[PDB]
Paper text:
Longer polyamines are produced by aminopropyltransferases (APTs), enzymes that catalyze the transfer of an aminopropyl group from decarboxylated S-adenosylmethionine (dc-SAM), a universal cofactor of APTs, to a polyamine substrate. Thus, spermidine synthase ([name]) utilizes PUT as the substrate for spermidine (SPD) biosynthesis. [name] and AtSPDS2 share the fold of polyamine biosynthesis proteins with the characteristic two-domain topology. The active site of AtSPDS is formed between the N-terminal and C-terminal domains.
The third determined structure is the crystal complex of [name] with two bound compounds, dc-SAM and CHA, which precisely shows the binding mode of the cofactor and the inhibitor of [name]. The adenosine moiety of the dc-SAM is stacked between Leu212/216 and Ile152/156 and it forms three hydrogen bonds with the surrounding residues. Two of these H-bonds are created by the N6 amine with the carbonyl oxygen atom of Pro208/212 and the OD1 oxygen atom of Asp182/186. The third hydrogen bond is created between the N1 of dc-SAM and the backbone amide of Gly183/187. The niche is formed by polar residues, Asp131/135, Asp201/205, and Gln107/111 that create three hydrogen bonds with terminal amine of the cofactor’s aminopropyl moiety. The key residues in this part of the active site are easily recognized in the structure of [name]-CHA, where the polyamine groove is occupied by the inhibitor. CHA is bound close to two perpendicularly situated Tyr residues, Tyr106/110 and Tyr270/274, and its amine group crates three hydrogen bonds with acidic residues at the bottom of the polyamine grove. These are the direct hydrogen bond with Asp208, and the two water-mediated H-bonds with Glu236/240 and Glu50/54. The [name]-CHA structure gave insights into the inhibition of the plant SPDSs by CHA. This competitive inhibitor binds inside the polyamine groove of the active site creating three hydrogen bonds at the bottom of the pocket, analogical to these created by the bound substrate.
Numbering used by the authors:
A (entry chain A): 35 to 296, 305 to 331
B (entry chain B): 31 to 296, 304 to 331
Write the structure that this text describes.
């Protein structure tokens, strides 16, 4: 126990505390802290955990563990790219571990992977400590930009992207404006007609108010399809994460029935793609109202 | 009276917080902030805790493991009940094993066709504390169709008439403790015997992220026993280890049972279950699907 998010009661325990999920915390046994640093944007920790392999933490929040990252990486990537024909040019906002790069690379149709990550410290420790995730960076198709995805999207050419994937941290910290309407509007402008967005869109158990405004906002902006998907990620709070899938008006996009089917994938397949749009009654009624 | 020292259960990792520990999920714990510890008791089977959480309402704990929070209980009780009951026509006779919180009882009651709900819970203390501290519970013990027995469900199944149940739901605690043999081949054989032809069992069958060795053993055993359908489904439960849990669905030799396409549609309205997510619960991640249908 060295970092302030580590136990005052016993050595070698990390607990994920945050006002974003009050009264609850996922606690993980720590074999060793591998890195602590303060970047320009974030407090950054990597630790070797007993049972989840290596762990990336940003401002006290678990961004990734080796044991379960296939769930988030595969779903956030293949939900959008398997939903459209022949994707060629794709933009990753955040994605500092390079996991999304690794999944995007699986698509042979892809010619260009642009990535805009605000925090070089995250890139640094990701290539050093998680090479099986950060292998993403090695694909000759990748262009890596260190910068705020807000500004990058503003300077993107209108109608230039087949897909945008917003692999962002939580609304507390530098990803704050990535959750807000003007950022969604710049995504829309930068997408071809029938082009798609896939965002990190929180917990239906923990964040329904937030998700309800994101969806209302996306319905004002994207006149194609607007859909919400969820997945299991044990080491995210509540055990689940969700995604906004949105298309700009034009060629029809059916996110629930992928027409572009893709080591072997460890999580994603064509059936769980459609199953992730099958929300629980309490959520479904909100999401589609 | 003094007795044998029992370790601290509360504030083991964060002062004011319960952390859920077990060798069934090594090197991790779900932690919940504690407002008030309502009950601590030792029965003839288990350590029994009830506490008021800060953000998950009341929480039942058995042998240090969370069994239920008020906030997320709708996911397990709706799925483990309607996945089986919505897969067979006009169920009349249903057996619940364990289920001492009475949640399953409640979701079983939503079914008009049902005429008797047999229940066998080994631990009278869990019944008593669930009725005391939890709001829907004592009422959803009062449905005239409920026949509650205190006993080991292994014994109850050996007592049952051959082919006498349309459906059995095993709402059990983990293999460590009194539920051990509900996971084992002989109890499964005895469920298949108690079921009619085309009859259905739904079992609490752990986490695909945590328990794949265990799950492959249950599935392989079920395939040997139940010559109908054998299918594994999963759902989201935040306060269960890894935040998912699963269910073995099996039907015996008889009228075909399609657990994936439920022929039967269905505590106020359902909060969680719906026809679409019935189907979605059988769509497993690739690493699980290989092991489970191989
Ligand atoms: C690490 S990734 C989440 C883990 C699951 N792939 C989220 C990244 O978002 C970055 N981030 C946050 N805000 C921004 C903005 N505004 N722009 C770019 N990148 C951002 C942050 O530095 C993380 O590395
Ligand atoms: C509380 S319930 C699970 C929580 C979500 N409904 C699980 C119950 O199984 C009982 N249980 C455990 N072992 C057995 C046996 N062997 N027989 C019957 N009931 C059992 C145990 O006492 C709990 O009340
Ligand atoms: N808790 C958040 C951290 C980033 C990815 C998942 C959401
Ligand atoms: N860990 C288990 C305890 C209660 C039953 C389902 C999950």
């Amino acid at each position: 126990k060295e970092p302030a998010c580590f136990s005052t009661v016993i050595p070698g325990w990390f607990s994920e505390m945050s006002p974003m999920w009050p009264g609850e915390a996922h606690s993980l046994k720590v074999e060793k802290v591998l890195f602590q640093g303060k970047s320009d944007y974030q407090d950054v920790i990597v630790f070797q955990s007993a049972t989840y392999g290596k762990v990336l933490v940003l401002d006290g929040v678990i961004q990734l563990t080796e044991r379960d990252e296939c769930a988030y990486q595969e779903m956030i990537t293949h939900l959008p790219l398997c939903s459209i024909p022949n994707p060629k040019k794709v933009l990753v906002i955040g994605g500092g571990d390079g996991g999304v790069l690794r999944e995007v690379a699986r698509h042979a149709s892809i010619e260009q992977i642009d990535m805009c990550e605000i925090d070089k410290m995250v890139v640094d420790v990701s290539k050093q400590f998680f090479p099986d995730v950060a292998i993403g960076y090695e694909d000759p198709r990748v262009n890596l930009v260190i910068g705020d995805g807000v500004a990058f999207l503003k300077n993107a050419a209108e109608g230039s992207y087949d897909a945008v994937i917003v692999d962002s941290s939580d609304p507390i910290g530098p990803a704050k404006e990535l959750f807000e309407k003007p950022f969604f509007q710049s995504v829309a402008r930068a997408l071809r007609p029938g082009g798609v967005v896939c965002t990190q869109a929180e917990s239906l158990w923990l964040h329904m108010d937030i998700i309800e405004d994101i969806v209302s906002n996306c319905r004002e902006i994207f006149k194609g399809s607007v859909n919400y998907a969820w997945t299991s990620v044990p080491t995210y709070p509540s055990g689940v994460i969700g995604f906004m899938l949105c298309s700009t008006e034009g060629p029809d996009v059916d996110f629930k029935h992928p027409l572009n089917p893709i080591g072997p994938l460890k999580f994603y397949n064509a059936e769980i793609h459609s199953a992730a749009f099958c929300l629980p009654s309490f959520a479904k009624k909100v999401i589609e109202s």
